[PDB]
């Protein structure tokens, strides 16, 4: 039905394009190919977003709308924008539409699914409360990521979102029997190359043999129509591995703000009145239909890490604030923490996790993790007193809390394996058993005689005592000279 139904371009205002159909308009979300010739190098494909009347329908362009004349011939596809799925996609790079953009021949496909799927019902939902050990101290201890969890990395410009996603791909996605999908939603085209090469070097993507990754990129260079829809294209591929193949899968959306921001561009041109802070009025609904599809069904299990840009370091902004409600482990990155020297720049008080609970994780995990949060809360109150009065003015017990709490802030830092170029030191995968025991002993006061800078930028307790030995030896030499 409506398969090759012909229409003509009624109006062109930016990426938003109106189309007149003689025999009635197609349905909503229907993809339309612009058949007319023009002087183009690349094709044009329009997706209907609204209907104006029975014969006219408003659309958004996935490619640029350059050289588009009025009354240009337009033809329907059959349904929504269709994207290839299955194991033939693994190893290959894709765009919003599902065309291969890596110059390695035609894809093996054999099936295509629509980009705009409906979210699972209540009956399809299932909770599997197991800890996903990220090998990172601040995450595993304070806001542990769960299996099947939707996870969000909130932070402003240049804080360590892209660095943390890359470290999670090293730490978790390599030793994983499942496949992975990377939604490059409106981010740097140059960052996409470095991921493709580093995965080829480590052999998670393999040319000659078995691949365990899919790349779907709709970057900053692309117009808003693509950058909006490209998040869903990747999600359709992950949905195939979840529902059909019945499997545990990872999803990586960098960045989910760029989805909301892309919709904010079209929404203005579509003629909607903007809501708070100039965003689209359908901001909560846009995230709703996208984020609800990202979930652990009875058939399989998506485990999505997402990056979330906090514009102007304003966490009260609608784009992050609306996203926070959807997530299981909310990771919040602060600029002042980054500039002070602590990387990753995770502010643990604003963070939270659902599985931070005595039932899911062990009793020893919860009790130690709470004491770190409690001690850091006392430390922030004491930090205001030292600024006013002084370090000497504090009590005898409170001085010892400051010495431990200062070490807790330093020990929360960690040199990442992907960030060897930045830190100038080799990485550290810290085990969950190491993380809990080392922090437990620090709270007890077993490492009071250990110096403070020993804890800065190291892994577990063995690396702390190793650096403390090097500090003792070098301090002994300089004192002798």
């Amino acid at each position: 039905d409506h398969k090759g139904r012909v229409g003509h371009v009624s109006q062109v205002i930016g990426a938003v394009v109106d189309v007149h159909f003689a025999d009635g308009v197609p349905p909503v979300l229907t993809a339309l190919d612009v058949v007319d010739k023009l002087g183009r190098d690349e094709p044009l494909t329009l997706e209907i977003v609204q209907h104006l009347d029975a014969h006219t329908g408003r659309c958004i362009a996935m490619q640029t709308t350059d050289l588009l004349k009025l009354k240009a011939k337009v033809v329907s596809t059959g349904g929504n924008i269709s994207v290839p799925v299955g194991r033939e996609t693994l190893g290959r790079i894709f765009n919003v539409l599902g065309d291969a953009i890596d110059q390695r021949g035609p894809v093996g496909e054999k099936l295509r699914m629509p980009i705009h799927a409906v979210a699972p019902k209540l009956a399809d939902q299932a909770a599997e409360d197991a800890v996903l050990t990220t090998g990172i101290k601040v995450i595993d201890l304070i806001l542990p990521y769960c299996k099947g969890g939707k996870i969000g990395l909130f932070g402003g410009a240049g804080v360590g979102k892209t660095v943390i996603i890359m470290e999670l791909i090293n730490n978790v996605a390599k030793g994983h029997g499942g496949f992975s999908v990377f939604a490059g939603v409106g981010e740097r085209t140059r960052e996409g190359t470095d991921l493709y090469l580093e995965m080829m070097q480590s052999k998670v993507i393999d040319l000659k043999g078995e691949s365990k990754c899919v790349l779907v990129y709709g970057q900053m260079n692309e117009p808003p129509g693509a950058r909006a829809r490209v998040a869903q294209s990747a999600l359709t591929m992950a949905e195939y591995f979840r529902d059909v193949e019945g499997q545990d899968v990872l999803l990586f959306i960098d960045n989910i703000f760029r989805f909301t921001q892309a919709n904010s561009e079209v929404s203005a041109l579509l003629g909607r009145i903007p809501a708070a802070v100039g965003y689209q009025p359908t901001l909560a609904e846009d995230l709703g239909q996208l984020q609800e599809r990202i979930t652990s069904t009875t058939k399989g299990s998506i485990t999505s890490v997402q990056a979330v840009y906090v514009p102007a370091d304003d966490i009260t902004d609608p784009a992050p604030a609306t996203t926070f409600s959807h997530l299981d482990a909310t990771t919040v990155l602060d600029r002042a923490v980054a500039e002070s020297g602590i990387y990753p720049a995770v502010n643990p008080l604003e963070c939270a996790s659902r599985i931070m609970d005595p039932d899911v994780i062990s009793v020893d995990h919860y009790n130690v993790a709470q004491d770190v949060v409690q001690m850091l809360t006392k430390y922030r109150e004491l930090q205001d007193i030292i600024a006013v009065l002084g370090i000497d003015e504090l009590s005898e017990e409170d001085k010892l809390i400051v010495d431990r709490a200062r070490k807790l802030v330093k020990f929360l830092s960690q040199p990442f394996q992907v960030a060897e170029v930045f830190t100038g030191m080799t990485g550290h995968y810290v085990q969950l058993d190491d993380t809990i025991d080392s922090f437990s002993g620090l709270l007890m006061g077993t490492y009071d005689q250990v110096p403070e800078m020993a804890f800065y930028m190291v892994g577990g307790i063995n690396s702390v005592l190793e650096k403390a030995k090097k500090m003792a030896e070098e301090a002994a030499e300089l004192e002798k000279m």
Partner: protein, 524 residues
């Protein structure tokens, strides 16, 4: 349910996500305002929608509800000519339901659009409603028919304190006459889908589904359902209210309802004002919360208690939607982010929180102890800012007692507070208050072979709860018998149990002491 068609009022003209406008059919019948209309998406299937605008042209503005993907321009539109009615009653309990009334798989109807009880229809709130928290039930006491706001940041315990209030009713409801049972209605507006599932399992494990029904409009579902979800929640409660029974209504949350209503208003070209919300966004929450009330003796004496949740961004009460709901409700329960991370859970900021009808709402026994606690904590908070007095000692123990995960039973709460009031936990240190309270409730030291000899008053006998509510602790019947129980418990705890703390200064015993004390925070 499958709604009742009548007349074909028009065709679908435009769609914009979850909103549409119609052109009238030949004749220009004109549908009635605020009524449901069924759009024929296929010959077999329909798609519901609510009428929001009746333009001069003849065009009719629609808010889409079901099968939004299946709606198209040029489709036929049938009218009901009636306001939205939904399934309501005892048969709906223990199930998840839409605002339209369809059950989610996992009874005479009632109007969702209804006027609130008038001046002579209501009465002063006297019946108490136990949240099961020593912090709340003393300082910010909720009465049946009251509207008590819950405000605070994300992950401060807004849902948990509301859900545990529903769970607290099961222990009473099981024992009491069903006339006075608190039937709960948890409305989930704009939440994530798995969060509703976890609450369903959590309600099921504590036997709450028997005395609870779950209204649900998740984030996947459209703005039309989210807008209408709290209204459908109250409708289900009003059945119990108008038929002489007491009810509870949690809206989680009104912040996401307002955003859904703003979407609807903006998409239909309603002039926006402050923070882009329409003119009547105050009226939205006002007519919702005013339907929650305490009826008179002349109309059954039933009730609908309201617990609206409203999320604040970085402790900002000056936001338009937050300030609106504060001015409607009878005070609030403020949840501070710094208290949450600091240790105090639930993180109830007592200075910021307030109940406008607190004293009259409380039980006679609870009014006795709580009147003194206001005097002690007032002096403790002042002296903490500016050498330990009696108020400083006893005040600090109350703060330790207010920490709790699951809700406390009325007997187990009031006795542990009465102990601290008369000063039974003065010699007991601050860190060992939860171990002292645990050994009071579950165990008992007097009976633990020796100095017992009480004729009736013990803590294992849970049935004394209702005798305490009648006579109070300060009374010739229970005063002397209670003060024995506490004297035996303190002397034995200080002698036998607290003596360990001077001793235990070794590895594997200090850690054993910690793990013991940390588990005592959870169980009250």
């Amino acid at each position: 349910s499958f709604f009742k068609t009548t007349e074909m009022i028009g065709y679908v003209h435009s769609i914009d996500g979850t909103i549409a406008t119609l052109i009238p059919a030949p004749g220009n019948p004109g549908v009635a305002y605020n009524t449901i209309i069924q759009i024929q998406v296929s010959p077999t299937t329909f798609a519901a929608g609510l009428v929001f605008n009746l333009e001069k042209d003849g065009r009719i503005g629609i808010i889409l509800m079901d099968n939004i993907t299946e709606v198209q321009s040029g489709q036929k539109v049938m009218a009901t000519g009636q306001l939205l009615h939904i399934p309501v009653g005892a048969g709906v309990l223990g199930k998840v339901v839409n605002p339209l009334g369809h059950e989610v798989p996992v009874s005479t109807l009632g109007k969702v659009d209804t006027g609130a009880p008038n001046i002579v229809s209501r009465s002063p709130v006297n019946y108490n409603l136990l949240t099961g928290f020593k912090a709340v039930d003393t300082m910010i006491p909720i009465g049946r028919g009251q509207r008590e706001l819950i405000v605070g940041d994300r992950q401060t315990g807004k849902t948990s304190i509301a859900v545990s209030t529903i769970i607290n009713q099961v222990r009473i409801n099981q024992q009491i006459l069903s006339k006075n049972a608190v039937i709960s209605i948890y409305v989930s507006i704009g939440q994530r889908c798995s969060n509703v599932a976890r609450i369903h399992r959590l309600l099921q494990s504590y036997g709450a589904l028997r005395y609870t029904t779950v209204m649900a409009a998740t984030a996947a579902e459209p703005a039309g359902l989210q807008y209408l979800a709290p209204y459908a929640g109250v409708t289900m409660g009003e059945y119990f209210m108008n038929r002489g029974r007491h009810c509870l209504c949690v809206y989680d949350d009104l912040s996401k309802q307002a955003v859904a209503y703003r979407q609807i208003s903006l998409l239909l070209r309603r002039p926006p004002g402050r923070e882009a919300y329409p003119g009547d966004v105050f009226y939205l929450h006002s007519r919702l919360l005013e339907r929650a009330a305490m009826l008179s003796p002349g109309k059954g004496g039933g009730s609908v208690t309201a617990l609206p949740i409203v999320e604040t961004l970085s402790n900002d009460v000056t936001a338009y939607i937050v300030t609106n709901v504060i001015s409607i409700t009878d005070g609030q329960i403020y949840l501070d982010t710094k208290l949450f991370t600091g240790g105090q859970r639930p993180a109830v900021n007592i200075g910021l929180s307030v109940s406008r009808v607190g004293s009259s709402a409380q039980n006679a026994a609870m009014k006795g102890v709580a009147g003194k606690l206001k005097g002690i904590l007032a002096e403790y908070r002042k002296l903490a800012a500016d050498v330990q007095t009696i108020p400083m000692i006893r005040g600090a123990r109350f703060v330790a007692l207010f920490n709790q995960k699951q809700p406390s039973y009325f007997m187990n709460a009031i006795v542990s507070l009465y102990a601290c009031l008369n000063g039974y936990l003065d010699d007991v240190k601050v860190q060992y208050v939860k171990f002292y309270e645990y050994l009071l409730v579950h165990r008992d030291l007097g009976i633990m072979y020796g100095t017992a000899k009480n004729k009736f008053f013990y803590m294992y006998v849970q049935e004394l709860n209702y005798l305490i509510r009648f006579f109070t602790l300060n009374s010739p019947i229970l005063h002397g018998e209670l003060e024995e129980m506490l004297k035996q418990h303190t002397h034995l705890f200080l002698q036998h149990y607290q003596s360990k703390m001077n001793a235990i200064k070794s590895e594997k015993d200090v850690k054993a002491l910690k793990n013991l004390l940390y588990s005592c925070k959870r169980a009250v």
